[PDB]
């Protein structure tokens, strides 16, 4: 339950439009349970956390790193019921990128191990 109610990583990143190719600021939270919730601003109190901007599952995903159109870009491709969603993000260093990427992967491995048994 409670590990399964925790926050793995949170912080700001750039999120690119699907179609309108602009980077936009989002405060994101990586949850143990596999949800990835994003916000316009860093969610102030608890009450603000309850109106998110972005919401997807990242248990069952591919973590890909790219250097276009910006260095330290990454793409998350994650299964979402019957379809995949792909989302493109950006951070200032490859080391930040590598930390975000490794943390997402940590959440997914957590749950792949639970599905196995
Ligand atoms: O702005 P454009 O390029 O037209 O494409 C939008 C944005 O990328 C949205 O990201 P953001 O909401 O951060 O602005 C995204 O929301 P999600 O990534 O949360 O799904 C929309 O997905 P849909 O509403 O799901 O179709 C996608 O259609």
d(CA 108, CA 89): 18
88's CB contacts (< 8 A; 6+ apart) are: 15, 16, 66, 73, 74, 75, 76
What whole-number distance in Å separates Cα of residue 25 and Cα of residue 16? Answer: 9
Q: What residue owns the CA closest to ligand 1's atom 10?
A: 17
Q: Which of 63, 64, 9, 16 lies closest to 36, judged by CA?
A: 9
Cβ of 15 less than 6 Å from ligand 1: yes
* Residue nearest to ligand 1 atom 22, measured at CA: 18
Q: Which helix (H) or strand (E) holds 101?
A: helix 94-116
Q: What's the CATH architecture for 1-117? A: Roll (2.30)
Domain-by-domain residue ranges, the chain? 1-117
Nearest-angstrom CA–CA distance, 95 and 101:
10
| Resolution, angstroms, 1 dp | 2.5
- Per-position b or e across 17-34, b if 16+ CB within 10 A of its CB: eeeeeebeebbbbbbbeb
């Amino acid at each position: 339950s409670m590990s399964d109610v925790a926050i793995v990583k949170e912080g700001w990143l750039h999120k690119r439009g699907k179609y309108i190719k602009t980077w936009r600021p989002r405060y994101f939270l990586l949850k143990n349970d596999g949800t990835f919730i994003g916000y316009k601003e860093r969610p102030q109190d608890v009450d603000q956390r309850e109106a998110p901007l972005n919401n997807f599952s990242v248990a069952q995903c591919q973590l890909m790193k790219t250097e276009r159109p910006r260095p330290n870009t990454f793409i998350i491709r994650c299964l979402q019921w019957t379809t995949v969603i792909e989302r493109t993000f950006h951070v200032e260093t490859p080391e930040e990128r590598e930390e975000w990427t490794t943390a997402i992967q940590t959440v997914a491995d957590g749950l792949k191990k639970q599905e196995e048994e």
